[PDB]
Design a protein around this ligand. Structure first.
Ligand SMILES: OC[C@H]1O[C@@H](O[C@H]2[C@H](O)[C@@H](O)[C@H](O)O[C@@H]2CO)[C@H](O)[C@@H](O)[C@H]1O
Length: 130
């Protein structure tokens, strides 16, 4: 029941499941922080292991494709176990691999990818209580 927002230190927006799409494989973007029962697609929590999940469907963050998207949690899939570590959303099995915001080149909402930690604010996040 302890949910939170993940805000980018790059654009000050927050991780958000694209268009509130509940289906697995939905792209995760950054969007203006909403408030109320409509913020569900922007709310996250950590399971007992500390692995990040979405309040919307309990799905985990998955970095199997070009951009991060939601996918059912699988303890056997290394690209679906992401945890909070200070200012970074780190891959549980490889802390050197962290999430980072990447602005759009087409004037759309920014997307997210996972790559080597390079110290930029694009790879820093702030956990913000609900
Ligand atoms: O565009 C991302 C943005 O979508 C909001 O939801 C919209 C969707 O964008 C729009 O195309 C559709 O017609 O209506 C949806 C309901 O508002 C999300 O609420 C927002 O968080 C972003 O994900």
């Amino acid at each position: 029941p302890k949910f939170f927002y993940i805000k980018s230190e790059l654009n000050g927006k927050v991780l958000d499941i694209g268009g509130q799409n509940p289906a697995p494989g939905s792209k995760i973007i950054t969007w203006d922080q909403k408030k109320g029962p409509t913020a569900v697609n922007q709310l996250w929590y950590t399971d007992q292991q500390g692995v990040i999940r979405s309040k919307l469907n309990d799905f985990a963050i998955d970095a199997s494709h070009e951009q991060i998207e939601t996918q059912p949690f699988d303890p056997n899939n290394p690209k679906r176990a992401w945890i909070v570590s200070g200012n970074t959303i780190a891959q549980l099995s490889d802390r050197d691999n962290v999430l980072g915001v990447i602005k759009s080149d087409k004037g759309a909402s920014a997307h997210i990818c996972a790559w080597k930690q390079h110290g930029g604010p694009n790879q820093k996040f702030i956990i913000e209580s609900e």
